[PDB]
Amino acid sequence: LVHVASVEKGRSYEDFQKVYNAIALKLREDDEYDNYIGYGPVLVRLAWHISGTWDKHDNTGGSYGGTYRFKKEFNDPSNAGLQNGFKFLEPIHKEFPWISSGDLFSLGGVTAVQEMQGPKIPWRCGRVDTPEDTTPDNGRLPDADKDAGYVRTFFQRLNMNDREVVALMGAHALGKTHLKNSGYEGPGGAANNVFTNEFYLNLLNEDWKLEKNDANNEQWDSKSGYMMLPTDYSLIQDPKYLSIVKEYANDQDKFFKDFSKAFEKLLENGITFPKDAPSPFIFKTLEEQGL
Ligand code: HEM
Numbered sequence: 018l019v020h021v022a023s024v025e026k027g028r029s030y031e032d033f034q035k036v037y038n039a040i041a042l043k044l045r046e047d048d049e050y051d052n053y054i055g056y057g058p059v060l061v062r063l064a065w066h067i068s069g070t071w072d073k074h075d076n077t078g079g080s081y082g083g084t085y086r087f088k089k090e091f092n093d094p095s096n097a098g099l100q101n102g103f104k105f106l107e108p109i110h111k112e113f114p115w116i117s118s119g120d121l122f123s124l125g126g127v128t129a130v131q132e133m134q135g136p137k138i139p140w141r142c143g144r145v146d147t148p149e150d151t152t153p154d155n156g157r158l159p160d161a162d163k164d165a166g167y168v169r170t171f172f173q174r175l176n177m178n179d180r181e182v183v184a185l186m187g188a189h190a191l192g193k194t195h196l197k198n199s200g201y202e203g204p205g206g207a208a209n210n211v212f213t214n215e216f217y218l219n220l221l222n223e224d225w226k227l228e229k230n231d232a233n234n235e236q237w238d239s240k241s242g243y244m245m246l247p248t249d250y251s252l253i254q255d256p257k258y259l260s261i262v263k264e265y266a267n268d269q270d271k272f273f274k275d276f277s278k279a280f281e282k283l284l285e286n287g288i289t290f291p292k293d294a295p296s297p298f299i300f301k302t303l304e305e306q307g308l
């Protein structure tokens with residue numbers, strides 16, 4: 018299966034910077050959401066989940082087709098709560114109807130990361146909506162109650178190695194688990210709408226206890242009020258993951274650079290970019306624009 022990026026007709030960097038800006042301004046305006054966490058984290062999770070259906074073996078799933086807009090994928094149990102991010106983006110799409118759904122969902126994630134003071138994430142346009150019958154079945158996103166070997170094997174399907182996996186998981190510094198969405202409850206650090214390397218510092222420095230939550234699932238809890246999923250905690254149980262966790266806990270810039278690469282790759286998996294395509298766009302933040 019081949020998906021060739023096709024630039025939305027006549028559009029260039031400035032058009033996409035305008036969509037960025039709309040998203041970024043709404044992120045600012047709608048600050049109350051989720052006990053004043055705001056929509057940044059859920060937009061990052063949305064961009065990951067629309068990308069994380071990809072299968073390298075046959076190029077099914079992936080961000081290209083924008084298939085999250087269809088009921089089967091929208092109602093994936095793994096996607097519970099992301100309707101909030103979709104609803105956030107609806108007025109943006111209404112204002113910019115020319116952008117594809119896949120470009121919008123992925124640009125949402127990029128915008129959120131940058132506006133939360135994360136790394137710059139280069140982003141490429143040209144995802145094209147595909148029909149309802151291209152929507153991947155439920156069950157391609159990962160379970161949270163598993164161990165390091167599960168995580169490693171899972172991410173091979175997405176063509177991600179150990180470093181890419183550990184880098185990507187640093188996003189779990191953002192937002193929180195919600196018991197009603199996933200059967201897990203709690204945040205991963207104190208600054209959960211600012212993008213930092215706190216996930217790794219918390220993994221290493223907190224005193225974690227294995228407890229049951231009110232949904233009868235096990236999770237790791239600290240007296241600080243933080244939590245880790247079993248899959249999060251597996252990153253310090255496996256000796257190879259642990260080395261990389263320590264590396265990112267001790268080098269903010271290295272984490273930023275490695276996250277940026279892995280996140281762009283995640284968002285671009287499955288897509289063929291013509292040699293004549295535009296170079297990746299690097300959007301200015303509102304702050305950089307004086308906006
Ligand atoms: C082994 C891989 C992964 C597992 C099992 C997993 C699991 C989870 C679960 C259970 C939640 C809570 C959802 C809720 O209750 O609302 C969640 C949230 C989150 N995930 Fe992951 N995830 C994984 C990887 C990733 C990756 C690769 C990213 C993106 C780079 C990511 C970004 C986030 C973000 C930002 C949230 C917070 C959402 C919010 O606050 O609304 N996750 N994840």
Ligand SMILES: N=C(N)c1ccsc1
Binds near residue numbers: 194203205
């Ligand atoms: N480890 C955490 N608190 C977490 C995991 C997914 S979103 C937040």
